[PDB]
């Protein structure tokens, strides 16, 4: 019947919050901007009716891409959502906007070469036409729906935690000259579920689903002392947004202070809330936000372990681990 009413969308992966030159906010690993597929869902103004959808796999798309000729049954005002790296069949089961808002993306689908992104909820001011509609086409300018000529920004639902360094502060303490062995590193209180999108651009995607602890990443020969600078960043983990929950995302470190014939080995599990002082440090938020990278520096000191005398099992948890968190942008290197 009334066919030929279509929508074409030009997209771009959001890098940093500020559209400015900053080398420190360049933290994107290869693959993290891959656009394996694009999906567009179009609802009527109230989200009561589905006007159309399209999912499409892409080859060699990264940072920016196009999804052309999305069908839109009617020439009416619409509610549009654009997503990248989502399941092929997600949109085929869509009915209403309110039901689509309930859909959850699991952290198990997230990897360095596949990160789910989405746009804000675009509510058109003008009705769409019975012909070809466009969004994000810079060269078309005002011919775009509501003159939205800049590519639709797609923001990651995931966040990345990086353990950049572990060191000790034992000089002038009773633990001076002793080494600590890093047994394992993991994430405590991580959100493994997320909404696919938010109504606002870079809005809240945090899902109410109960937090979970990650599997521990073991280390064979990871020894630390006073002056240890780790250039490899031994632990990198994707997590979902976590800012509203009482169970704040934490770094977990099982560490052992080595013996010396006078004192026994001392093993504990050390935990610390990531970005507890973000707002005080000049960042736009505390805790974990979507599309942000968290650079963690860990320190052991004179208050970290006890001097247990040598004798002629379950490790205790110390929530008072001293850590420094640098919140950085998730931007790429300069493009063409």
Swiss-Prot record:
Pfam families: Fim1C-like_C, P_gingi_FimA. Its main location: other. Residues 1-19 form a propeptide. Keywords: Cell outer membrane, Fimbrium, Lipoprotein, Membrane, Palmitate, Signal. It is found in: Fimbrium; Cell outer membrane. One of its GO terms (cellular component) is cell outer membrane. PROSITE patterns: PROKAR_LIPOPROTEIN. Belongs to the bacteroidetes fimbrillin superfamily. FimA/Mfa1 family. This is Putative fimbrium tip subunit Fim1C. It comes from Parabacteroides distasonis (strain ATCC 8503 / DSM 20701 / CIP 104284 / JCM 5825 / NCTC 11152).
